[PDB]
Design a protein around this ligand. Sequence first.
Ligand SMILES: Nc1nc2c(ncn2[C@@H]2O[C@H](COP(=O)(O)OP(=O)(O)NP(=O)(O)O)[C@@H](O)[C@H]2O)c(=O)[nH]1
Ligand SMILES: [Cl-]
Ligand SMILES: [Mg+2]
Lengths: 166, 170
Amino acid sequence: SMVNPTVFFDIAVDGEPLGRVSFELFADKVPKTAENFRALSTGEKGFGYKGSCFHRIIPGFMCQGGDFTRHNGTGGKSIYGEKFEDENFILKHTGPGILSMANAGPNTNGSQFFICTAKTEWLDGKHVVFGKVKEGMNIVEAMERFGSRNGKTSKKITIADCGQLE
Amino acid sequence: SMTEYKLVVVGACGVGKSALTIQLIQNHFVDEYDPTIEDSYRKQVVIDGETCLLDILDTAGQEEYSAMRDQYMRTGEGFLCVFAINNTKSFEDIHHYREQIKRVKDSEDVPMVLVGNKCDLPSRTVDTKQAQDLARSYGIPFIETSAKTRQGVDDAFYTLVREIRKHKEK
Ligand SMILES: Nc1nc2c(ncn2[C@@H]2O[C@H](COP(=O)(O)OP(=O)(O)NP(=O)(O)O)[C@@H](O)[C@H]2O)c(=O)[nH]1
Ligand SMILES: [Cl-]
Ligand SMILES: [Mg+2]
């Protein structure tokens, strides 16, 4: 992209390399939300995603991660404080690869996010969409296979490294 | 002989539905919150001399996905309706859960128990009289529980089975 930043996650399965997933972050349309995810991916504020887990993976739906504070699916924090408001609902959950914010209701964005593996249109207007997988959707499909119906993963899926691409 | 009962645990997020279920099934409590998607458990017990299999569906507190939640209620024979005694909104939410159950099952008389959980805590916002009056208005039992100390846990589930058995006599 000439305008939108690209970040990457190197995914691991019980510490073994699985592959790299890269994301286009839609700073052109969702700047505050995209900047949060960018900065948490570089770690430049002194905290962020590196080392954290995809704790909830449900085949047919999504891979959810991003809790680097409680490390158990309940936590998270943004670069703006513990939570920030829903920025806009311009973009919708149109299919696999969509990157969107997890939340606990209105205006509770922190750091948790999910990657859709199917269209999830019932989340439109409730979760802020701010990016999409650029490369490595096959790695996301591989992660999805470690999930289960209640989200528990059969092996521990982590962000072994992450950062911003030039 | 034995019988089998489909019990469904419902109520707002964080009130202790899972902690109550895990105490019944696994006889332990942890402070760590593990938010539910959906879990099912089975346990053989004896209640009032009569052996039965409990099939317990532990539901998430959320109320989207009406298609799935309606199916929970269609299949369920009795409902634990849980609130937390230090969470007034969770008590106010009880009415909605009960209305949904009555609608889905096409009945004003569905086996249910009102459960006021976390009674070990010093931060009460819902007093016992409030809950007893609400349960009285529904014609259902009220049981105060603590998943942490295990107070009332067996009573809540066993009372629900008693309620199902009374309903089946009608
Ligand atoms: N002190 C105290 N804490 C309790 C009690 N029951 C549950 N908790 C705590 O309350 C939190 C939420 O409990 P949990 O059983 O997961 O709630 P839930 O109703 O299943 N939540 P969800 O709707 O997300 O599935 C946990 O931290 C748990 O340890 C109780 O009786 N006493
Ligand atoms: Cl949801
Ligand atoms: Mg639960």
